[PDB]
Amino acid sequence: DPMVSKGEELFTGVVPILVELDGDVNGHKFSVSGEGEGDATYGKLTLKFICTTGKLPVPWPTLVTTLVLCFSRYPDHMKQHDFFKSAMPEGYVQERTIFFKDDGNYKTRAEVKFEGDTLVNRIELKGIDFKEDGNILGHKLEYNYNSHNAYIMADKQKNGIKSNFKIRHNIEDGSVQLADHYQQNTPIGDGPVLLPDNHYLSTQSKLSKDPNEKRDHMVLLEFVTAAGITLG
Numbered sequence: 001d002p003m004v005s006k007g008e009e010l011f012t013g014v015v016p017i018l019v020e021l022d023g024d025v026n027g028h029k030f031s032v033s034g035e036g037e038g039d040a041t042y043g044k045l046t047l048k049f050i051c052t053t054g055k056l057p058v059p060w061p062t063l064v065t066t067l068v069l070c071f072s073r074y075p076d077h078m079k080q081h082d083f084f085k086s087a088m089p090e091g092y093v094q095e096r097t098i099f100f101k102d103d104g105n106y107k108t109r110a111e112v113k114f115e116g117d118t119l120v121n122r123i124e125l126k127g128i129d130f131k132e133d134g135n136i137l138g139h140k141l142e143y144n145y146n147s148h149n150a151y152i153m154a155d156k157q158k159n160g161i162k163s164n165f166k167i168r169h170n171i172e173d174g175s176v177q178l179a180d181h182y183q184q185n186t187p188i189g190d191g192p193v194l195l196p197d198n199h200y201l202s203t204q205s206k207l208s209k210d211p212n213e214k215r216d217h218m219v220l221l222e223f224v225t226a227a228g229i230t231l232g
Contacts, residue, residue, distance in 0.1 A: 001079075001080070003086055003192070003194060004079050004080070004082070004086075004194075006085075006086070006088070007070075007082060007085025007086055007088060008079075008085075010085065010088050010089060010114070011038070011040035011041075011070065011071070011085060011088075012041075013039070014037045014038070014039050015037060015038050015039075015040070015071075015117070015118075015119050016035075016036075016037055016117065016118045016119070017034070017035065017036045017037055017038050017045060017047060017068060017071075017118070017119050017120075017121070018034065018035060018115075018118055018119075018120045018121070019032070019033070019034030019035075019036075019047065019049065019067050019068075019120075019121045019123070020032075020033055020034070020120070020121070020122050020123065021033075021034075021063075021066065021067065021122075021123040021124075021125060022123070022124055022125070023058075023123075023124075023125040023126070023127070024125070024126050024127070025057055025058055025104075025106070025125070025126075025127030025128075025130060025136075025137070026057075026104070026127060026128065026130045026132060026137060028057035028058075028137070029053065030051060030053045030054075030056060030057055030058075031051070031052045031053045032049050032050065032051055032052065032056070032063065032067065033049070033050050033052050034047045034048065034049040034050070034067055034121075035047065035048060036048060036220075038068065038070075038071035038119065039071070040070065040071045040072065040073060040085070041073065042073060042223070043071065043072055043073030043223045043224050043225045044071070044073075044221075044222070044223055045068065045071045045220075045221075045222050046219075046220070046221055046222075047067070047219075047220045047222075048210065048213075048217060048218070048219050048220075049063075049067055049217060049218045049219075049220065050215050050216075050217050051215065051216040051217065052215075054216070055216050056216050057137065058127065058136050058137065058139075059136060059139055059140075059141040059143075059169070060143065060207065060218040061141055061142070061143065061144065061145050061169055061207060062098075062100075062106075062136060062141065062169065062179065063125075063218075064145060064205055064207070064218075064220065064222075065096070065098070065167060065181060066096065066098075066106065066108050066110070066123060066125060067121070067123070067220070068112055068119060068121050069084045069094075069112075069185075069201070069224060070084040070085050070087075070088060070112065070119065071119075071224065072084060072201060072224040072225065072226055073223075073224065073225045073226065074226040075225075075226060078199065078226045078228070078229075080194060080196070081152075081194065081196035081197060081199050081226065082194055082196070082226070083152075083154075083160065083161050083185065083193055083194050083195065083196050084112075084185070085194075086192075086193040086194035087185075087187040087188070087189070087193050088113070088114060089113060089114035090113060090187065090188045090189035090191075091111055091112050091113025091114065091187075091188045091189075092111075092112055092113075092160065092185050092186060092187050092188055093109065093110065093111055093112075093185065093186050093187075093188060094108075094109075094110045094111075094112055094183065094184075094185050095108065095109050095110070095183070095184050095185075095186075096108045096181055096182060096183045096184075097181075097182045098167075098179050098180070098181050098182075099179070099180040099182075100130075100135075100136055100177060100178070100179050101177065101178040101179075101180070102134075103129075103130055103131055103134045103135060103136055103177075104127055104128055104129035104130030104131070104134075104136065105127065105128060105129060106125055106126070106127045107125070107126050107127075107128075108123060108124065108125045108126075109123070109124050110122060110123040110124070111188065113188060135169075135171055135177050136177075140171055140172050140173070141169045141170065141171060141172070141177060142169075142170040142171070142172055143207055143209075144170060144207055145169075145205040145206070145207050146167075146168050146169075146170070147202075147203065147204040147205075148165065148166070148167060148168070148202075148203060149165070149200050149201065149202050149203075149227065149231065150163050150165035150181075150200065150201045150203070151163060151164075151165065151198060151199075151200055152196060152198065152199050152200070152201060153198045154195045154196055154197065154198070155184060155185075155186070156195060158184065158186045159186065159187055159193060159195065160184065160185045160186040160187060160193070160195075161184070161185045161195075161196065162183060162184045162185075163181070163183040163184075164180070164181065164182050164183065165181050165183075166178060166179070166180055166181070167179040167180075167181060197229065198229070199226060199227075199228060199229050200226070200227040200228060200229075200230075200231055201224055201225070201226055201227065202224070202225050202226075202227040203222065203223060203224040203225075204222070204223050205220060205221065205222045205223075206220070206221040206222075207219070207220060208221070
């Protein structure tokens with residue numbers, strides 16, 4: 001399928017990634033710049049993010065989902081369901097509302113597209129209704145991340161996809177902070193895409209620090225795989 005091969009050719013080998021985010025949470029303005037590479041053959045990306053405005057006013061783990069699902073590994077029997085690569089190089093808009101239980105919400109809008117040979121994720125984020133001294137603005141979340149699945153559903157009206165899933169953030173008191181994610185993706189172009197049938201993505205992320213890096217930062221290793229139509 002030339003529509004499938006288009007994405008395969010765009011994501012063959014190691015693709016450079018640039019991530020740029022401008023944020024405002026409760027009036028705290030911040031920016032994040034990320035660089036790295038993705039290897040969609042293995043569902044793999046490596047990225048290092050810098051807070052370029054000083055200290056990040058929210059915990060790094062809360063930004064992992066916001067900071068490129070085109071790098072997901074879709075197995076051979078699933079390639080017809082890979083909306084994300086099919087929208088390339090023109091790209092897609094990824095929009096979310098992330099509801100933090102008993103706290104505020106992030107609203108995010110991002111464009112994911114190629115600029116030359118580089119896959120770019122450009123993001124605006126606005127956070128509201130946060131507690132200035134809660135788990136998020138108070139930095140009470142552990143610097144780690146939990147694996148999860150997410151159900152992807154076609155959004156025919158928008159020629160795109162939608163997904164609603166739960167992220168669990170460990171709190172430093174031993175409890176868990178829920179982050180309920182609403183997501184919708186729409187192609188930037190007006191041409192055909194691969195509109196998928198419902199299926200699951202499975203993802204694991206590892207967060208680490210560069211001991212030589214004095215700036216506030218996050219090193220991310222992230223694997224995403226299309227697990228199947230069903231979980232079985």
